[PDB]
């Protein structure tokens, strides 16, 4: 939120003000969970099964 690089932290909007969250909490899924292979800003890279 203070505009600083931290790979273990996440920045989301929470009712008019931006708040901090955890990188471990982030998940991607189609029919089964997906393996995250890159995260930076608004972008997420993932390999997903048939969904």
């Amino acid at each position: 939120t203070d505009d600083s690089h931290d790979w273990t932290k996440l920045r989301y909007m929470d009712n008019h003000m931006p708040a901090d969250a955890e990188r471990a909490g982030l998940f991607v899924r189609t029919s089964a969970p997906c393996t995250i292979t890159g995260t930076m800003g608004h972008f997420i890279l993932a390999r997903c099964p048939k969904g």
Binding site: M13, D14, N15, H16, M17, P18, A19
Partner: protein, 211 residues
């Protein structure tokens, strides 16, 4: 000889951006009015937020900023929080004295509901030695802060003898209140079942004693 006017009440949700304003009856508010913003939390708890229009007191979160918007002083809460629920007062300087606004009650979504914790105590014996008996019903930690307390002596709704305080805000921002049912040493010894019923955000809690 100037009248500062503020919104009466404003309701927002955690995470939103909300603006409170401060209007002067004599003209546009300017930097020479040194708009001040003060917050009142329950318990007659005052803290200063902003001074001289836009100077944030030290140790006041950055979500708070002041400015002049149009012809009035404004306070913006960027990312309002549950903790920001309070009364905000603006003050304006007029060459020789200060005039305070009526204050804006701000409500912010948050603090999940909490049921009351009710306890009913019997008249102590040292008090029954006075030819008096007072049943105390204490209710704490409830939110929203609104309850209904009903007493029932021996199955029958008492309707005279009781006094219930007004919900008072505790520190955690939940409320408390107590109700008293005063009998006589004698009224005491007569009836046999006392009960203090507290109704809060739809559930009821009955605490009964047995003499």
């Amino acid at each position: 000889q100037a009248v500062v006017t503020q919104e009466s009440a404003l309701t927002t949700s955690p995470g939103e951006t909300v603006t409170l304003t401060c209007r002067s009856n004599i003209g546009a508010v300017t930097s020479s009015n040194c708009a001040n913003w003060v917050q009142e939390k329950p318990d007659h708890f005052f803290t200063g937020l902003i001074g001289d229009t836009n100077n944030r007191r030290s140790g006041v979160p950055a979500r708070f900023s002041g400015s002049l918007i149009g012809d009035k002083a404004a306070l913006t809460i960027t990312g309002a929080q549950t903790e920001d629920e309070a009364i905000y007062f603006c003050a304006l300087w007029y060459n020789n004295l200060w005039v305070f606004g009526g204050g804006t009650k701000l409500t912010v979504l948050g603090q999940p509901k909490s049921s009351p914790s009710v306890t009913l105590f019997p008249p102590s014996s040292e008090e029954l030695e006075t030819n008096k008996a007072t049943l105390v019903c204490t209710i704490t930690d409830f939110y929203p802060g609104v309850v209904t307390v009903d007493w029932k002596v021996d199955g029958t709704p008492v309707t005279q003898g009781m006094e219930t305080t007004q919900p008072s805000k505790q520190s955690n921002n939940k409320y408390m209140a107590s109700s008293y049912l005063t009998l006589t040493a004698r009224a005491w010894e007569r009836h046999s079942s006392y009960s203090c019923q507290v109704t809060h955000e739809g559930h009821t809690v009955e605490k009964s004693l047995s003499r």
